[PDB]
Amino acid sequence: LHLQKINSIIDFIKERQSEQWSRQERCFQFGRLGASLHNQMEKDEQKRLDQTKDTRITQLLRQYYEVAHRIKEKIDKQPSILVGGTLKEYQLRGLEWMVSLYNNHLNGILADEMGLGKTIQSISLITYLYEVKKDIGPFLVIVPLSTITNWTLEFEKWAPSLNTIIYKGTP
């Protein structure tokens, strides 16, 4: 009688413990599946000259000068992060245009002739945006070889407040 009381209590205790673990697992498993369901719901959602003249304005609103550059700004002062030099009117106009495009969620391509300070323009735009928004990054820059060290020196000189990670050398 006594031996069986103990034997049967031990049995119930072990069964109860395994039931806990089961419930805990089926729970965690249901949760972890809904994450996947969410991911699929998200993927599914994501999947879901005069005509050009009007389509340009319509697509710009969805994304001529007053429309593409609805948000306007004028910056005649160099960002407080840039030191060791001065700015030019051309660089100021380029930076203002790029800032207006960024405020309008628009991209663009620069076609400067030569030696117009493209690295300085990029540094000024990045430093201004980061000082205004307090959003120092993450930011990605693509620099072709034989120019990595020049960009490194320019970043060290003009903008010590912005650090950079550069991959080079042995694997």
Partner 1 sequence: TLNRKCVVIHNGSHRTVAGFSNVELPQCIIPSSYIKRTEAEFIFGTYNMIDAAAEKRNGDEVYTLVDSQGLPYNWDALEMQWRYLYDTQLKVSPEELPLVITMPATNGKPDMAILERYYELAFDKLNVPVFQIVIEPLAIALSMGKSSAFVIDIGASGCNVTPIIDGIVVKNAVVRSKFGGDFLDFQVHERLAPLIKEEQKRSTDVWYEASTWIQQFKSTMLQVSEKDLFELERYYKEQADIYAKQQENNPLVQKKNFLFKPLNKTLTLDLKECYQFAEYLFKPQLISDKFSPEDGLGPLMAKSVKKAGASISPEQVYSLLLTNVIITGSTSLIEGMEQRIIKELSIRFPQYKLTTFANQVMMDRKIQGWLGALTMANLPSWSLGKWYSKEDYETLKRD
Partner 2 sequence: PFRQDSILIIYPRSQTTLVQFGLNEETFTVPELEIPTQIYRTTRQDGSYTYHSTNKDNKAELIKPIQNGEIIDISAFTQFLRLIFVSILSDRANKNQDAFEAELSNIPLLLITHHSWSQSDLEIITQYVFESLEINNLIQLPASLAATYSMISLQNCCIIDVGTHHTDIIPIVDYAQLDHLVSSIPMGGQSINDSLKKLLPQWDDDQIESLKKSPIFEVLSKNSDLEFNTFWDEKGNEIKVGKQRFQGCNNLIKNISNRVGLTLDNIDDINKAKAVWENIIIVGGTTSISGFKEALLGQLLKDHLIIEPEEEKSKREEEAKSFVPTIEYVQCPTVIKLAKYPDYFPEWKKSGYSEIIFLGAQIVSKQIFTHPKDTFYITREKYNMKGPAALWDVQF
Annotated binding site: 112-119
CB–CB of 64/56 below 8 Å?
yes
What does the alpha-carbon distance between residue 78 and residue 74 come to, in Å, rounded to a whole number? 12
Work out how close the CB of 116 gets to partner 2 at its nearest, in angstroms, rounded to a whole number. 36
Does 50 help bind partner 2 (rule: CB under 8 A)? no
> Footprint of partner 2 on residues 19-48 (CB under 8 A)?
23-24, 26-28, 30-35, 37-38, 41-42, 45-46
As to burial, measured by CB atoms within 10 angstroms (0-12 exposed, 13-18 middle, 19+ buried), residue 135 is exposed
Numbered residues of the known binding site for ATP: 112-119
**Which listed range, 11-19, 49-57, 67-75, 110-118, lies at the site for partner 1 (CB under 8 A)?**
11-19
Which is closer to partner 1, CB of 24 or CB of 55? 24
CB–CB of 106/63 below 8 Å?
yes
Does 13 help bind partner 1 (rule: CB under 8 A)? yes
Q: Which of partner 2, partner 1, none binds 4 (CB below 5-8 Å, type-dependent)? A: none
Binding-site residue total for partner 1 (CB under 8 A)?
14
For 16, half-sphere exposure in the C-beta direction (CA atoms, 13 angstrom radius) is 6
Determine how many CB atoms are found less than 10 A away from the CB of residue 123. 21
Peptide bond into 171 cis (omega under 30): no
> Footprint of partner 1 on residues 109-128 (CB under 8 A)?
none
Which is closer to partner 1, CB of 2 or CB of 105? 2
Does 26 help bind partner 1 (rule: CB under 8 A)? no
Contacts of 145 (CB under 8 A, 6+ apart): none
For residue 152, give the 3-state DSSP assignment.
Answer: helix
Q: Which of partner 2, partner 1, none binds 41 (CB below 5-8 Å, type-dependent)? A: partner 2
Binding site residues, partner 1, CB under 8 A: 2, 5-6, 8-10, 12-14, 16-17, 20, 23-24
